[PDB]
């Protein structure tokens, strides 16, 4: 059940007018992700369409930091040998690296400003 056209043009219309990490555009952005349990692939399609390539290439870079700290600590589901996180997150049997991903995400685009 992925989002489809509608809710993606809803999420950027509602979200116009406030800056990337505002308040509104977190609010807005976390019960996305948390409502439509979206994998890694999903997630880059949605920043592509809604900020440009110079905030998808800061929130890439500060997503690299977070994801490294987190997985280089070890994680519970994590297990270096098969893949990057990228594509563990992208298995639908992997929930937790899926939920994990999720969250550096959005704390990732929240420390923008």
Known sequence: ???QMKDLQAIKQ???QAAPGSPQF???IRLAVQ???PTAKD???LLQY???SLVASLHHQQL???ISEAETRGITGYNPLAGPLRVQANNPQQQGL???YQQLWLAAFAALP
Request: aromatic share 8%; glycine share 0%; hydrophobic share 30%.
């Open 26 to 28: 977190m609010q807005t």
């Open 50 to 52: 809604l900020c440009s």
């Open 64 to 66: 690299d930091s977070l």
């Open 35 to 37: 409502q439509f349990d």
């Open 98 to 100: 899926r939920r994990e």
């Open 43 to 45: 997630l880059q399609d």
């Open 14 to 16: 509602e979200v116009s």
């Open 1 to 3: 059940r992925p989002w």
